[model samples]
Target: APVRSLNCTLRDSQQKSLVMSGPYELKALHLQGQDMEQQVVFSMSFVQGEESNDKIPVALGLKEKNLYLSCVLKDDKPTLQLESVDPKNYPKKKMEKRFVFNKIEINNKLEFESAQFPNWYISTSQAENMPVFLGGTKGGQDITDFTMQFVS
Candidate 1:
């Protein structure tokens, strides 16, 4: 069974917090793309102006025991570089060479940060749907603005 939600907190470089103020949807990517039964990929479905369905795909990368976030391939394209692993016969290198995520923490239920653009936390705080961007107290007031959440 997969769980979903549109609730989460994002910390921007500004130090101020942007919370999800409207209805949003976050779902796990299973049975599609890398679609591992394990928690690996996720997608965000947002409503624009109360009547629009927009979705974004996100890939989960784990390195040195830290979880990171990266944009999922468009159309959830399936990777064909390495051999797919079966839970019954999992291998080490296969897991290590899975995919490359820019690197950000989405594992923590409380919060996550941007690795490539350090300090730029994804945030949202209004009655409008702004394309999620990477900005923060560091001065991204308009560049990167987006919201994300984890659903169990």
Candidate 2:
């Protein structure tokens, strides 16, 4: 169960794209001129992972570098982060980066539900220029969900 080299853009509630401003900076920005590279394409491997039996394991990163999305436990809460790791070599020996998620597809929109914390879902602010973080469970379809545009 894997979605390999999937090329699609993630547009948030405010019509912002998930952009990599830095090796560890994931901010939302609206599409502007020459913003072709702002949108991110996910690299998903859904064969399951540790604590991810039926969940889809994804490795998000820059195509030019080894930095990828990772979920690190902060205090008792898990935090979303981007770490230096080769996407081609994900799930390296004895590493629990906590990158597993379950897909919540609504029409063509999608939500990334963390496998480690089922109650927490990935989200963004209604305002622009904010870092992507885990939002509340009250239902953030307007903010938590992303309308996907699949590319050929």
Candidate 3:
């Protein structure tokens, strides 16, 4: 258990909801190439118990890009998955997002590649009530500050 960074404030009933998972270590001494050092090895969140977030999930290292995780996930269906350790920086280049009030359902893909866009995977399966906020962006930018390292 050795990845820790804590201090997140999200209020919506306040029981618990703060996110940024590890094995992680994102060191942006002040941005250089790809915004400098970022490491995350594990992540999974399935909290569907909305309203009761006293906010407490501290196993700190150093995380703040407006870190927010306010609980809710019992799942009539809930899914949000994104991965790209090194997918050749999103080649084949196709980016689009919009799953509005009908709620959520986005099953993106970029598998089968030795040519196109290597290392890519996105998942948003049968989700349920989430998204007062969410984020994405790689070589194109929008990855603010992320450096968390805690693993047990």
What is the TM-score of each predicted model, taking all chains together?
Answer: 0.26, 0.74, 0.18
Each model's lDDT: 0.29, 0.64, 0.22
> Could you give candidate 1's per-residue lDDT for residues 1-152 as a string of tens digits?
22221323333232233322223222211122342233222322121111112322222322122232332223553211212233342212222312222223333322223333335444433323333333343243342232333544
List runs of model 3 lying over 4 Å from the truth.
1-17, 22-78, 85-87, 90-152
- Best first by TM-score, ranked: 2, 1, 3
Q: Which of the numbered candidates is closest to the native, going by highest lDDT?
A: 2
lDDT of 2 by residue, 68-125 (tens): 5666677867777777765576533333536655656665567777766765777887
User: Which consecutive 10 residues in model 2 have the weakest lDDT in total?
Assistant: 46-55
- Candidate 3 residue lDDT tens string, 1-152: 22223332221111112223342212111223452233222322212222123321221112222221221122632223222323342211121221111111123211111111122211111222232222222222222122223344
lDDT of 1: 0.29
Task: Tell me the number of clashing residue pairs for each predicted model.
Answer: 11, 0, 32
TM-score, candidate number 2: 0.74
Which sections of candidate 2 miss by over 4 Å? 1-3, 49-57, 86-88, 91-97, 138-142
Clash pairs, candidate 2, are none
